[PDB]
């Protein structure tokens, strides 16, 4: 099956890709923000919203991936190739989860339309060369 | 955070653990069934239901895990070590996803109540030694909400 | 082009794929059944139905594959590899034709909706581990005025 | 069973054989014409016509025959015996599929009666010796309901 | 993105591909025809039509492609390498622009629906073997009360 | 023939030249923005506007140049030269295409009159020596949909 996790939320993988990689916080900083803002809702027996349902699964999936990556790095054929599994996480699946976690956390905080407008505003601003770019980035606010 | 993926759906990790591991189809057989029964809804731009939203993420998460496991296994010279990665998937994260996929797929067809009643019925039947247990396992189906006498009375 | 031969019949290659390979009868047995049930219609100068048209072509296509396999094994090969090519055709493309012949024969015999519901029922049953699986498979089957008694 | 693929379409294998082998377009050109003129209909979930059903199957069957002949050519370790398989295909089943693809594509494009009348006209004209044969071939010239 | 340059003009890349490569004029002859028939319009500050807008860009793009292909051809030392590049251009982007320039020039000159009907007619005619093909290609182009 | 691709749009090559070369985004960033903002219109069977028709052709033309330059590079004997022809294209026509893609994308987003006024404003600002140049560049922004006069009229 070819599922786009953003599609039921009015976005697409291609649109999230318009943000540069270094826009996103780390997964750890995203997970700490999800707890600070939504821990009680995420841990409750209520659905709350489709964003909460999706965010719950993503949090648990990152736990699955890191447990697997930890086992690989620890019970290893080599020494110091641990650096290799880390690099794959940083390059590949870490970026996917930074996009996804940022998307759900921001939509819960600012609303989908505000988030998507900001995404396009920032993506255009950051691609404007510094010769022309206004000094302050667009603002994400309700 | 300590999130139980079943809690918003009226169940718990411990309850799903009551089914034995060899009750569940493989992840592959579950994913092929999810596609045969629900592909169009899963791929659509509509939420459809909280079970659909959760099932979408679980399908994608399995892809993430297998891609990671494949990259590791492919970049391993020792073929016995590739067999270690497969065995780790089979022993640990495969069973979690067999439980989770089975739960959402079955709930989407039969409803939470029927599924949880069946889970408990099967878990009790399979723990009964075979001399005492009827030869046929409990059946998974939604029981009629009313008797035939009740149905006819309200015609 | 990207033609799916099931699409005009309300199905897809991927849906037929949901049945395991060992569900389908052999090609020989499918061709025997097509003859026993439908020979006169298949040989008639009438279209009869889209299923009949498709089934005619499928039967002839299998004939083309077998004729080619045999001519290659007969005219050329040693006696030992006489059946080598027939063996490849049955291995690779046999499953595709077992699916296709089964679909049209069963649709003609039981109706499309009955067949498609049975297909999904069987695919779920067979993926249920035998610990939990009821012993009997799902069944493929199809189903006076008051004045008379006054 | 004895199935003639043309019988439900009002023709026969023997009638298509009345056209000389070099009358028919190549398989490549027939497949490109089916795509250029009918790709959307052939790929649609609608039956459209008995010709569409036959064309769908014939197109897919040709693909299978090509995979089979290729496997034969690759696994026949004698380079001369790969050459017999090719020439046999061109002489026998290649001609069968050129006939079949031509028939259905032409019926959809020019109309069934027009195709069948033209077929007989062309077959008579080409058998007329050049001492007597007019220089130009007969003329082939131009919703749909299908009874039994 | 997957942009088909013909889609906004009611055609597709696959349909233009139905014409054989030797149907099209050379690029030089297409560019001379665009100039002879449309130079003033193409050079004007008016849009004129979407065909003119597309044709302007295609003419300029071909110039860029030719400046590149020329630079490559001149700086190669081996005649077989230079012929590899010409052959690659002729088969690929050279053919694409012959198709594209022909399409817009002919739509402007003969009308769009005339062009599309003719394309399909020609593609079928040229695939008909010469044994059956008519010698000439397809053509591209009151009551009494009235007088009382 | 002497065709200026900007002439039917009320501009000229020389006017686009008034912007310095390091003003323009990279080709990759322009193509990413065209997709993010206009993919559906660009891929649709409608003309939409002369800017869309021109932008479609420019996108495809850059692709043609890159495909040819990439293929030629694959034939070069020295693997270190694999991108030599791609570099030649960027060096000789990269700026031309950055100008053209920027022009159509910005006109679709802000309107031709706004774009041309901004172009002149920026070109004058950047030529003002830094001793006198105010720190913030002119701003490129869409006109408001309704004027203050109209807003007050409907109060
Ligand atoms: O996306 C952002 N941050 C982020 C998101 C997450 F989902 C995280 F998990 C996480 F760690 C950080 C972001 C982007 C722009 C921005 F300007 C600010 S802001 O300065 O903080 N701010 C401005 C004023 C508003 O009123 C509120 C927010 C924050
Ligand atoms: O698909 C089946 N068989 C098949 C199909 C073909 F197209 C063939 F060519 C061919 F040889 C065999 C099949 C599947 C399930 C099944 F239960 C039976 S059943 O027992 O025979 N049966 C039950 C009662 C009904 O009333 C009638 C049929 C048959
Ligand atoms: O859980 C089961 N199967 C399963 C679930 C999934 F989520 C899968 F992905 C997958 F492959 C298989 C199961 C358990 C008991 C059982 F009896 C049957 S049954 O025989 O098939 N059956 C009975 C009648 C009903 O009406 C229908 C289904 C199936
Ligand atoms: O496409 C054709 N030519 C072409 C197109 C271009 F875009 C060119 F740039 C260019 F050089 C040549 C073509 C095709 C068939 C054909 F029969 C003729 S025709 O003889 O010339 N003719 C017949 C009567 C009509 O009324 C007028 C045209 C011309
Ligand atoms: O059978 C023919 N062509 C064919 C068929 C197919 F099924 C193909 F796939 C394919 F490539 C070519 C054929 C035979 C005679 C003939 F004169 C022409 S004609 O010149 O083209 N012509 C004349 C005027 C009409 O009005 C239209 C058609 C075409
Ligand atoms: O031309 C610019 N950027 C650009 C154009 C393209 F065509 C691209 F493809 C691409 F990547 C970047 C540009 C120029 C000045 C400027 F100030 C900004 S701004 O800061 O982003 N901004 C300000 C507020 C408005 O409201 C909106 C936009 C952007
Ligand atoms: Cl909280
Ligand atoms: Cl579905
Ligand atoms: Cl049982
Ligand atoms: Cl019979
Ligand atoms: Cl079509």
Q: Which tokens sit at B93? A: 């994260």
Tokens 């932008």 correspond to F55
Would you state the structure tokens that stand for residue B72, as one six-digit string? Answer: 């590791």
B8: helix, strand or coil: helix
**Topology, domain C1-150:** Hepatitis B viral capsid (hbcag) fold (1.10.4090)
State the DSSP H helix or E strand holding residue C17, giving kind and residue range, or none if neither. helix C13-17
Q: What is the rounded CA–CA span in Å between residue B70 and residue B85?
A: 9
User: CA-to-CA distance for E18 and E116, rounded, in angstroms?
Assistant: 11
**Do the Cβ atoms of B104 and B54 come closer than 8 Å?**
yes
Task: Please state the separation of Cα D145 from the chain's center in Å.
Answer: 22
Environment of ion ligand 7 (residues, CB < 5 A): A 39-40
Contact flag F25-A134 (C-beta cutoff 8 Å): no
Q: Which residues from B are below 8 Å from C128, CB to CB?
A: 25
Ramachandran class of B38: left when φ > 0, alpha when ψ lies in -120 to 50, beta otherwise: alpha
Alpha-carbon distance of C3 to C57, in angstroms, equals 15
Report the SS3 class of residue F54. helix
Residue whose CB lies within 8 A of the most ligand 3 atoms, among B138, B140, B143, for a mutation test:
B140
* Both tokens assigned to C51: 């299923």
Tokens of C79: 């006696």
For the domain spanning D1-148, the CATH number is 1.10.4090.10
D residues 77-116 lying closer than 8 A (beta carbon) to C? 81, 84-85, 88-89, 93, 96
Q: Are C98 and C62 a contacting pair, CB within 8 Å?
A: no
Chains B and F touch (3+ CB pairs under 8 A): no
Distance, in Å, from the CA atom of C16 to the CA atom of C6, rounded to the nearest integer, reads: 9
Q: Which two tokens stand for residue C19?
A: 């049945």
Q: Note whether B31 and B101 are within 8 A (CB).
A: yes
CA–CA gap between residue E11 and residue E23 (Å, rounded): 18
- F-facing residues of E in 114-143 (CB < 8 A) are none
d(CA D2, CA C143): 32
Query: Which chain B residues contact residue C19 at CB under 8 A?
Result: none
Resolution (A): 1.7
DSSP annotation of F20 reads -
Q: Do B25 and C129 touch (CB under 8 A)?
A: yes
The subunits that touch chain F, with at least 3 C-beta pairs less than 8 Å apart, are A, E
d(CA B23, CA B101): 13
- In 3-state terms, what secondary structure has residue A46? coil
Which chain B residues are within 8 Å of C120, Cβ to Cβ? Answer: 36-37
Cβ distance of B78 and A77 shorter than 8 Å: yes
Residue D113 beta carbon below 6 angstroms from any ligand 5 atom: no
Q: How far apart are CA E43 and CA E41, in angstroms?
A: 5
Enumerate residues lining ligand 3, CB below 6 A: B 25, 29-30, 33, 102, 105-106, 139-141; C 124-125, 127-128, 132-134
- CA separation for the pair E72, E81 (Å, rounded): 10
Spell out the residues 6+ positions from residue A130 whose beta carbon is closer than 8 angstroms to its own.
none
Q: What is the DSSP string of C127-138?
A: HS-TTTS-SSPP
- Backbone φ and ψ for D54, nearest 5 degrees, come out as -65, -45
3-state helix/strand/coil string of chain D: CCCCCCHHHCCCHHHHCCCCHHHCCCHHHHHHHHHHHHHHHHCCCCCCCHHHHHHHHHHHHHHHHHHHHHHHHHHCCCHHHHHHHHHHHHHCHHHHHHHHHHHHHHHHHHCHHHHHHHHHHHHHHHHCCCCCCCCCCCCCCCCCCCCC
Q: Which of F22, F29, F36 lies at the smallest CB-CB distance from A131?
A: F22
Number of H helices, E strands in chain A: 6, 0
SS (H, E, C) C41-64: HHHCCCCCCHHHHHHHHHHHHHHH
Distance A34 CA to ligand 7 centre (A): 9
Alpha carbons D124 and D132: distance in angstroms, whole number: 12
Q: E120 near D33, Cβ under 8 Å?
A: no
Closest-CA residue to D140 (of E113, E15, E124, E19): E124
Return d(Cα D31, Cα D104) in angstroms, integer: 12
B77 SS3 class? coil
State how far the Cα of A122 lies from the Cα of C5, in Å rounded to an integer. Answer: 48
Closest approach of C104 to chain D, Cα-based (Å): 13
C133 contacts: CB under 8 Å, gap ≥ 6:
B137, C125
Tell me which chain F residue has its CA closest to the CA of residue A119. Answer: F36
Q: What is the rounded CA–CA span in Å between residue E126 and residue D29?
A: 10
- E window 8-67, beta carbon within 8 A of D: 14-15, 18
What residues does the ion ligand 9 have nearby, CB within 5 Å? B 136-137
Closest CA to A108 of A53, A70, A59: A53
CA-to-CA distance for C72 and C74, rounded, in angstroms? 6
Q: Counting every residue, how long is chain D?
A: 148
Question: Which of D3, D45, D93 has the CB atom closest to C8's CB atom?
Answer: D45
Cα–Cα distances (Å) from F82 to E70, F74, F79, F87, in that order, read 19, 6, 5, 10
User: Considering only CB atoms, which chain C residues are within 8 Å of B24?
Assistant: 129
Joined together, the tokens standing for residue F119 give 């172009």
Q: Report whether residue D140 contacts ligand 5, using a CB cutoff of 6 Å.
A: yes
Per DSSP, chain C holds a count of helices (H) and strands (E) of 6, 0
Residue nearest to atom 18 of ligand 2 (CA): C140
The minimal CB distance from B57 to the residues A61, A84, A85 is found for: A61
C-alpha closest to that of F122 among F19, F40, F2: F19
Q: Which residue has the tokens 């009229």?
A: F153
Query: b/e string for C61-71 if b means 16 or more Cβ within 10 A?
Result: bbebbeebbeb
CA dist E124 and E78 (Å) reads 41
**Do the Cβ atoms of A72 and B85 come closer than 8 Å?**
yes
| A10, A23 Cβ separation under 8 angstroms | no
- Could you say which of D23, D37, D136 has the minimum Cβ distance to residue E131? D23
A135 contacts F136? CB cut-off 8 A: yes
CA dihedral D140, D143, D144, D148 (to 10 degrees): -170
A1-142 classified as CATH 3.40.980.10: no
Residues 6+ apart with CB under 8 A from C108: C37, C38, C49, C51, C52, C55
Work out how many CB contacts closer than 8 A connect C with D. 120
The answer to whether the CB atoms of A1 and B42 lie below 8 A apart is: yes
Phi, psi of C95 (to 5 degrees): -60, -45
Q: Are A26 and A32 in contact (CB under 8 A)?
A: no
Decide if domain F1-155 falls under CATH 1.10.10.10: no
> Contacts for B11-20 with beta carbons within 8 Å, 24 or more apart?
B11/B103, B11/B112, B11/B116, B15/B116, B15/B119, B16/B99, B16/B100, B16/B103, B16/B119, B17/B99, B18/B119, B18/B120, B18/B123, B19/B99, B19/B119, B19/B122, B19/B123, B20/B123, B20/B126, B20/C131
């Amino acid at each position: 099956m070819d599922i786009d996790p953003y599609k039921e939320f009015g976005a697409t993988v291609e649109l999230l890709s318009f943000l540069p990689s270094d826009f996103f916080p780390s997964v750890r900083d995203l997970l700490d923000t999800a707890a600070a803002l939504y821990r009680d809702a995420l841990e409750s027996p209520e659905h709350c919203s489709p964003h909460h349902t999706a965010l719950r699964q993503a949090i648990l999936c990152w736990g699955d991936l890191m447990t697997l990556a930890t086992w690989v790095g620890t019970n290893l054929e080599d020494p110091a190739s641990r650096d290799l599994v880390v690099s794959y996480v940083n390059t590949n699946v870490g970026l996917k989860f930074r996009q996804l976690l940022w998307f759900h956390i921001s939509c819960l905080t600012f609303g989908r339309e505000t988030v998507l407008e900001y995404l396009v505003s920032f993506g255009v601003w950051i691609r404007t060369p510094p010769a022309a770019r206004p000094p302050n980035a667009p603002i994400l606010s309700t």
